[PDB]
Design a protein around this nucleic acid. Sequence first.
RNA 1: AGUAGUAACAAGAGGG
RNA 2: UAUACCUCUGCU
Lengths: 217, 46, 60, 135, 177
Amino acid sequence: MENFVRTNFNPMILERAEKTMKEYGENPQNEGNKFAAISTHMEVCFMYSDFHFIDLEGNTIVKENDDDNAMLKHRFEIIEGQERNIAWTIVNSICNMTENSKPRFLPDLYDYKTNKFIEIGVTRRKVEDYYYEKASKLKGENVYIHIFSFDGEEMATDDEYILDEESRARIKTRLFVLRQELATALEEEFSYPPTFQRLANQSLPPSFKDYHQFKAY
Amino acid sequence: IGMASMLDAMLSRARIDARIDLESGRISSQDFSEITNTCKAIEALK
Amino acid sequence: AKSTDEELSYTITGDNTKWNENQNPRIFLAMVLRITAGQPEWFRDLLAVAPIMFSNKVAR
Amino acid sequence: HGTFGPVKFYNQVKVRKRVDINPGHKDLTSREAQEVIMEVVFPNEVGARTLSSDAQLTITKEKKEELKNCKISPIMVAYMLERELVRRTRFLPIAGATSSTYVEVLHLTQGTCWEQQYTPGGEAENDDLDQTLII
Amino acid sequence: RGIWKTNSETGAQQLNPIDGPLPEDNEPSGYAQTDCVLELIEGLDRSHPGLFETACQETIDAIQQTRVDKLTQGRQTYDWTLNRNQPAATALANTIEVFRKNGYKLNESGRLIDFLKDVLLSFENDSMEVTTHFQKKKRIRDNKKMITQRTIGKKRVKLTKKNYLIRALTLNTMTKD
RNA sequence: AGUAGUAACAAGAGGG
RNA sequence: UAUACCUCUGCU
């Protein structure tokens, strides 16, 4: 559905959803494959970042205000939903001041306490089909891929859940509602507009009467 | 290269540079709020 | 190298008079279309633009 | 550190040939050299690609080490590294030695009717020495 | 000796000499024969197999990778905005601004082929709007006499479908010094 | 007058 | 209409 992201989500996410899709060819009218799927890729990042901060020493704090104020700092940074040149400047600035791995492909978030890059990739497949598709490819380096499910079940790397149980509980119910509204809801082109086409027809040898005709000859 | 805005690109950099310069570096805690207040003030002016 | 000892060789020190005034935009469209034969038709039509505008050119 | 020998006068035969004009070019492509320069002078602003070869790694660590804490415009550093690293060639008429360090001093070593014998400072590369030994 | 024909879009009287009568003297002629050209270009293709292919293949890759930036480089271009020569980059920025002010923003992508689309799409507009500038002689007091003051204000002007098209097919002239 | 040479300079514009 | 001045310009 074209108005799946428009009725449900808040106005801030819609402008983010408009951004980087304009590049290849397709638009919001054609496909319902990877149109709205990009929108929740930013919604999960806000839930991951909001209500989670770090203390002066270096310990996790799950507060209620959510506006830093001097003594406490954000725990995650939003890589997804940016420009490509800005996206890597986020990654590289981090890896300079902490000697860590530089990933090959783009990550979506980074935990500041545990030092873990997070590639988000939730879908209608269960767990093992999309955990080992990415893990046997982005291997060697420790990219922390958090594979959720559409219903409830959850399988991370070593079951090493960096995020506390209160916030990830509501993240399951966030995806549990959007699952239920699925049922109820490389090219290149250049051609002449008609004015130039008529000019094209008049810029031929005298025997020919049409651009298409001369091009065939 | 970027389809994004010139001001918006500068703002994204303004925040994250202040972040790493404090988080693991030689910038004070009061200054990070001073930079992000200005970035929020600029974000308000559009 | 490719001639025999029996053969002659002459050289024209050469100049073409009125070079630009007699090179035609329509002929340039023929060249571009033949050079691009069998390539995608968007690429043929893109490169064909310049010769066309040159055929309909006007001079201040 | 160059050494001059005598000047001989004779009909100097010059073969127009493409030759290197950037002596001590650490041989890399323009794209490879761009990654190196970015790493050295603009470390935070590097793209997706990384230092692929050990050529690129050793040159980047060396440049970072040599150029550390030098008050000068980064634009000038990027410029000089671009000129230094990337190989460049030109068609030139050359009598005798074609190596880069000899090409550098063609104005001094050859005229129409004369050869000024000259050996540049520094050691010849084994590649060049093996090629000339064979000839 | 060629064939005169009035243009549909501009109304310009256009001479076509090609495939025309063969010349009968040594005077400068422009009666090029399409079939003779194509024979020579075919001859060139036979003698250098795979040249046209890779030549096109390299030009394909260029068109994909080329950005709008690339037209800031190079010599002065004729500016249709002002009917004068201007530096390349200002003529580019002027054409992009007036294109953006009308209904043309494919070049916002940054790639050059999209700017080229905007140029062909701009011929369809029959009311192309351009801001000109003109001098205005204001009067202001000064310390205690009133002196005349040259100032500049802008005025919008719509163009015909001819007017714009004529200007896009216009090439400037001057003497070579 | 003189420069010059296939068309210009020999001040232009403004305070109108 | 002239005669003084004043201001900008010297590849635009």
